[PDB]
Amino acid sequence: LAESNIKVMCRFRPLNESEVNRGDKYIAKFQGEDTVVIASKPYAFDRVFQSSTSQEQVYNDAAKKIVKDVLEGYNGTIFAYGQTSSGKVHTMEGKLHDPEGMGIIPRIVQDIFNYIYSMENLEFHIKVSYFEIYLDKIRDLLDVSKTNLSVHEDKNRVPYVKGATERFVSSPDEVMDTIDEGKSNRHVAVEHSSRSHSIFLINVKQENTQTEQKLSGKLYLVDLAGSEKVSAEGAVLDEAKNINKSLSALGNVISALAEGSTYVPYRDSKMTRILQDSLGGNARTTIVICCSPSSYNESETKSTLLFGQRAKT
């Protein structure tokens, strides 16, 4: 199909108490349930979550329908974009298995398994893959001896990563441990800042024994490393230029879709080529951009919001 259906959503965290003492202003105005005003500039979105909004409700509005569609055979992608101390990890992971405080990913894992456990004539297979785009290279986060993987396309023109590690999982914890293993292998540097973009893949295969009909859906979880304004003046500079280039290539595709372009330049980067069949078209997408309301951050929460704006129609 040719919908476009990409939604961008912004979640502001509470300034916390320790940031309120160091001396700061809240610098974030809201009007509508979907617009935010910083420095008297309005930024419109599909949805804006303020500090009082629970984890469950960000999951219900960003992810819950994407998961449903994957359990129905479709593809989907979720992006998490944020600068450091924006509330990204809290939003994506949170305190997992506090049922009130877990973020997006753990609720996704439990909604998949509650769906499975809820079914006799239905056979399942969940494959998880986990890799990163670091310095334009695809590294496997589940098998670190595999540092430079390639993208190819099969007979049906759907893209794949030759050699990426696929793990079969059968329980919510077996999924969370695969994720923790990968995280220890991601490129981080300097506070704790992602030097790469990570892609987590949940592939949910189903077979119905009586109708002998099959289903197969791909859910991608992409953690975007924040953009850097960078002038080691060497290996780190390389890291920053690639982060920015691949984000701009991503923006280009996303914006082509949102603006109803009839040529969406997927081929331009490895990440958008990998996610080609899960970005746009009959696939559903949510970009969650996380921002700090804090004044200390106003220069770059402005930059985050501008990035989110690239996805507005």
Method: X-ray
Q: Please state the domain extents for the chain.
A: 1-313
Among left, alpha and beta (phi > 0; psi -120 to 50; other), residue 235 is: alpha
* Total residue length of the chain: 313
Task: Note whether 74 and 1 are within 8 A (CB).
Answer: no
HEC letters along 25-86: CCCCEEECCCEEEECCEEEECCEEECCCCCHHHHHHHHCHHHHHHHCCCCCEEEEEEECCCC
Distances (CA, A) of 296 to 16, 35, 42, 85, 293: 13, 21, 19, 11, 9
Q: Please, what's the b/e burial string for 141-179 (b: 16 or more CB within 10 A of its CB; e: otherwise)? A: bbeeebeebeeeeeeeeebebeebbeeebeebeebbebb
For 223, other C-beta atoms within 10 Å of its C-beta total: 23
Q: Does domain 1-313 have CATH number 3.40.850.10?
A: yes
Token pair belonging to 205 = 């295969």
User: Quick one: CA torsion of 246, 249, 254, 257, rounded to 10 degrees?
Assistant: -150
Breakpoints of the chain, after residues (C–N > 2.5 Å): 119, 190, 231
Could you tell me whether strands 122-134 and 137-140 are parallel, antiparallel, or unpaired per DSSP bridges? Answer: antiparallel
Angle at 180 between CA 178 and CA 185, to 5 degrees: 100
Distances (CA, A) of 102 to 169, 257, 302: 20, 31, 27
* Distance, CA of 112 to CA of 24 (rounded, Å): 41
Type of residue at 18: S
Q: Which residue has the tokens 């280009």?
A: 252
Token pair belonging to 266 = 């997927």
Among left, alpha and beta (phi > 0; psi -120 to 50; other), residue 287 is: beta
